[PDB]
Design a binder for these strands. Structure first.
Ligand SMILES: [K+]
Ligand SMILES: [Mg+2]
Ligand SMILES: [Mg+2]
Lengths: 136, 75, 177, 116, 54, 50
RNA sequence: GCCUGGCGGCCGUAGCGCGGUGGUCCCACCUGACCCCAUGCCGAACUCAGAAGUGAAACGCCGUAGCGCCGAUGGUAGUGUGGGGUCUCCCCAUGCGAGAGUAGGGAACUGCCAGGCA
RNA sequence: ACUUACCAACCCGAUGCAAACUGCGAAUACCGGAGAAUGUUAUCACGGGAGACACACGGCGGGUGCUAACGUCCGUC
RNA sequence: UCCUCCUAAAGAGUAACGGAGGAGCACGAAGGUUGGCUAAUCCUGGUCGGACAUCAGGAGGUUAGUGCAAUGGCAUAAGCCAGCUUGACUGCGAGCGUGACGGCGCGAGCAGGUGCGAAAGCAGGUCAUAGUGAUCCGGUGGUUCUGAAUGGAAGGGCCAUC
RNA sequence: UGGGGUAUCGCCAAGCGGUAAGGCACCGGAUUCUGAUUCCGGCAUUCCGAGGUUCGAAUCCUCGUACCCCAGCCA
RNA sequence: UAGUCCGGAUUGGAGUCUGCAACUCGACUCCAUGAAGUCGGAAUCGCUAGUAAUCGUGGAUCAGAAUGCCACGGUGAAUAC
RNA sequence: GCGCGGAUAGCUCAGUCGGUAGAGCAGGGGAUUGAAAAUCCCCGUGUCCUUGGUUCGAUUCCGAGUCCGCGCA
């Protein structure tokens, strides 16, 4: 599980998730798993999907996780009233918008990249698509 | 462990550009010298900029550091 | 002024001959000679630094400037602005007189003298060496020493490269093993 | 840099005199000349200028660039400035110590009638 | 230099066993007897006897 | 805190006093300040670090 | 007209870096220091008396875009008002409209006074 | 002093994130000045009388909550 | 209770048992002025001397410093060093800011007297924003202002102050 | 989970911001046929781990760890 | 009256002898070096007169190697209620 | 299901910035003894529960399991 090594403040406000994404082209690799839905992704979903990919295209290839969590999500325990402070940091999510290339892959044929990205897009909560490295 | 904040100090620009002032009028109550004193403007002890002559407030950008002066045009 | 005159004829002429300079002023000249004695054991004793100051007062012909600590560091148990060394900046006539005594009579009185290292340039021609005894200067009375106190010399010159400082210093014959 | 160090020494009194709005007598000392010029309160335009590079001053001097030369220049700026209706200036020493021949120049300008 | 805070730095005459009579300024305040000078010190013979071992 | 309050009394015949604060521990010496005396209307020496 | 010095406007299209050049005057380094004055030591700096020597450094000027800097048009984001949906987010009409990036521009321009040369 | 499938500072190139980051920066709002039309002075000051100081939902911007609540706490309509 | 940032929607203000931190002082120099100076860190060389105490040179640019939090400031330095000093003055104050009020804040200038500077000038505390407590009651010093027949005094007032 | 306390030589236990004190033990010598007792000498913890304030931290502050004590209620 | 002209350990250099052969690993000499040690904690030992103490000399083993062992003499106590 | 403490030599247990596996007892060899006990010295072929992964290298760090035990609305 991914999590920043050392923050600056422990608890972040909710804020909103509007507009489109910045990481949009397949930059590092050759094939990409790009988001279409909005959503947000916990570190467990990123790890689950990465294990599905790494298993699927065996220890050949090279995989880039282009998103990183760095946003702490706090929850209140059970049978605790409202108020009395902000909750506790339970997990860490990345906020996703439509357009984020969530993962990249290189060093495989395209048909294995289709296969691993299908296998791993079923571990994520957002609708997802397959993209290739377009040249300009 | 939290739950405290100071009282709001009501800083900022009190007279804007082109706004006619009397002598003595505070123009920008502020905290450092975010705005510097120009012609006919004095800077108080807490970096309050006040009209030293009558006229009109003139916000400008001068000098090699692009500082934000405040002059007063005699009027 | 003996080595200053010797400079003004034969070292200026000699270095204009060796290196193919155009300007007569492009030649290296020695700017200053700083004598530091960074005592450090004066964290507990003041008379020890006073005796150090008397020794640099004897070796050069000037009062030294007792230097203070720039930062506080705890590795050596010091504090900000605590006096920890003393130095003399010799320049002008006294630079040449001290340089004459140094290369003439002080350097040969070094114990087990093999020569001064030629790789003790800081890249910009400026020599710096260290003596381990203050006894090697003929002024320091051997019967009046209490602590052995070396010091470090630094010849600062106007040469750009360090081979150019090899040339400048070596034209005073300045031993160079 | 020696020149840049001098200018940052000058700057406080320069900006203060531009803030008050007084006609300033800017001096300028060089190892063989002294220069003196009276500058309007807008700072752009000069009024009076004398110096040792002028042959009207330089011919009657032994050496341009000592205290006698500077006293001659101060006398000249005071004379020309009184001829052009300027009476009360403020002395801009322009980064030099008020000690040597800038003191000689300014004392000589005060003897010959220029009010500061 | 300033006034009298500095030690008295008067010209003396050093003389070693090499016959090198040499007058210099030094604040000893006394004439000087030496053995080794820059002229006739075993520096080059010293380097030779250093290398000449094996 | 530790820093005490003292009266700088006037050296002229008046009873006029300024008042201020002194660290009594680190500065045990008395405090003499040529302040302004408005009854005499003149700058007189003031004494008495209490 | 060209060059140099001073004081300004302007505040990176103006600054950096690389390369070339200048000293008759100017400037800078320089020469000396018992004096005016100075160094928590030192004429290094400050200061004074000078002018032998060099433009090496510095500074100015001329090139050079390697960089900094400026920067459209178009599109995108956002958004005021009115309306709509599948409504934690968007769409429509309409008004404003970036930031980044691209083409490109670009090694400043100028006022007063003073001196040197023609 | 001799080797090394391990990690890795700084620097450079490329990619993201930030309420408590900003070498950029809107719309709107706000303050000031001038002008036309319209409005039963709508404005300000002073004086008589109050009441009220438990608010609710709905849009938009948010905090909290689980972007839960016909939840809670603000801003604005 | 008070200070700083965010929430806070680009003027001000704005809530919650919202997210983060601090104060209840220090200083007679750490204030005033005049004159001067410019950091951190790293590299290289160098006696003890070391990763890091002093010296010299270079790169670097304020990543430093600011008596103590944070924010905004600061090179003309508000940072650092030295000389002389008491303006850390007294009476006022055009005009403003800010509060429901009590109150709080900024203030050119006027008068008297002063410090620094050759002078222009600057100085009514500190780079700014925290470092605090109404009234009553009472204590101390000054001032015939009052002083229950009258002259005093007691007590009260006024000014300073605890 | 909150509040309080403790962590210092092998063990139990003192430490005041400028130095680590005691007992038992352990080590060496002596007494003794030998061991215990005894006697004479010694040593000894840079102070739980990390960061910070300070010229300087066992000492002060913050965080983590490990062990104790008190509370964790009315419905 | 000193760590000293005490003390001689340790160490460097230069040697002599014996012995096939002195590196491990002799003895002695010369020059240089010059520690610790200033009368010894608890405790413990020997000695009753030519004794203890102190001073030298010899021998056996042995090519060379004793501060040990076995002998020899010189000076020569104190004390035993 | 959730929160914890355990699995290391035949037995009973230690063991944190990852560095060639530790102790006591047991067992074996030796010294000692008339002989033995005792005492002293020496000696560990341990998949550090399984399995993957990270690292040059894992008892130790991460991911997933097996068994034992303790507690829980
Ligand atoms: K064992
Ligand atoms: Mg077992
Ligand atoms: Mg166990």
């Amino acid at each position: 599980m991914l999590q920043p090594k050392r923050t600056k403040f422990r608890k972040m406000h909710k804020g909103r998730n509007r507009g489109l994404a910045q990481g949009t082209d397949v930059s590092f690799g050759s094939f990409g798993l790009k988001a279409v839905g909005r959503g947000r992704l916990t570190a467990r979903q990123i790890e689950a999907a990465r294990r599905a990919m790494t298993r699927a295209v065996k220890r050949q290839g090279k995989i880039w996780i282009r998103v990183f969590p760095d946003k702490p999500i706090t929850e209140k325990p059970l049978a605790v009233r409202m108020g009395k402070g902000k909750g506790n940091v339970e997990y860490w999510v990345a906020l996703i918008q439509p357009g984020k290339v969530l993962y990249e892959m290189d060093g495989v044929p395209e048909e294995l990249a289709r296969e691993a990205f299908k296998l791993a897009a079923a571990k994520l909560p957002i609708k997802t698509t397959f993209v290739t490295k377009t040249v300009m | 462990r939290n739950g405290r904040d100071s009282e709001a100090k009501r800083l900022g620009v009190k007279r804007f550009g082109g706004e006619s002032v009397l002598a003595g009028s505070i123009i920008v109550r502020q905290r450092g010298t975010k705005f510097h004193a120009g012609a006919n403007v004095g800077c108080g002890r807490d970096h309050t900029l006040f009209a030293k002559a009558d006229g009109k407030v003139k916000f400008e950008v001068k000098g090699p550091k692009n500082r934000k002066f405040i002059s007063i045009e005699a009027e | 002024a003996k080595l200053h005159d010797y400079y003004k004829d034969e070292v200026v002429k000699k270095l204009m001959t060796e290196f193919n300079y155009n300007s007569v002023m492009q030649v290296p000249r020695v700017e200053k000679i700083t004598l530091n004695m960074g005592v450090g054991e004066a964290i507990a004793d003041k008379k020890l630094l006073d005796n150090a100051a008397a020794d640099l007062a004897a070796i050069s012909g000037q009062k030294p400037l007792i230097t203070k600590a720039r930062k506080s560091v705890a590795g050596f148990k010091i504090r900000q602005g605590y006096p920890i060394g003393c130095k003399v900046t010799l320049r002008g006539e006294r630079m040449w007189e001290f340089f004459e005594r140094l290369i003439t009579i002080a350097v040969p009185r070094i114990r087990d003298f093999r020569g001064l290292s030629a790789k003790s340039f800081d890249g910009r021609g400026n020599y710096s060496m260290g003596v381990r005894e203050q006894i090697i200067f003929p002024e320091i009375d051997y019967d009046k020493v209490d602590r052995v106190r070396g010091l470090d010399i630094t010849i600062t010159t106007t040469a750009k490269s360090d081979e150019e400082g090899r040339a400048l210093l070596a034209a005073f014959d300045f031993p160079f093993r | 840099d020696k020149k840049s160090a001098r200018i940052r020494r000058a700057t406080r009194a320069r900006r203060k005199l531009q803030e008050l709005g007084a006609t300033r007598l800017v001096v300028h000392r060089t190892p063989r000349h002294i220069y003196a010029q009276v500058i309007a309160p807008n700072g752009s335009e000069v009024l009076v200028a004398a110096s040792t590079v002028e042959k009207a001053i330089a011919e009657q001097l032994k050496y341009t660039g000592n205290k006698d030369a500077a006293a001659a220049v101060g006398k000249a700026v005071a004379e020309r400035a009184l001829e052009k209706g300027i009476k009360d200036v403020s002395f801009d020493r322009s980064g030099f110590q008020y000690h040597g021949r800038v003191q000689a120049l300014a004392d000589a300008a005060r003897e010959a009638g220029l009010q500061f | 230099m300033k006034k009298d805070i500095h030690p008295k730095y008067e010209e003396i005459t050093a003389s070693c066993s090499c016959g090198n009579v040499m007058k210099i300024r030094s604040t000893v305040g006394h004439d000087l007897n030496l053995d080794v000078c820059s002229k006739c010190h075993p520096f080059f013979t010293g380097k030779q006897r250093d290398v000449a071992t094996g | 805190g530790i820093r005490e309050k003292i009266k700088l009394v006037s050296s002229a015949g008046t009873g006029h006093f300024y008042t201020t604060t002194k660290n009594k521990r680190t500065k045990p010496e008395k405090l003499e300040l040529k302040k302004f005396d408005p009854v005499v209307r003149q700058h007189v020496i003031y004494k008495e670090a209490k």
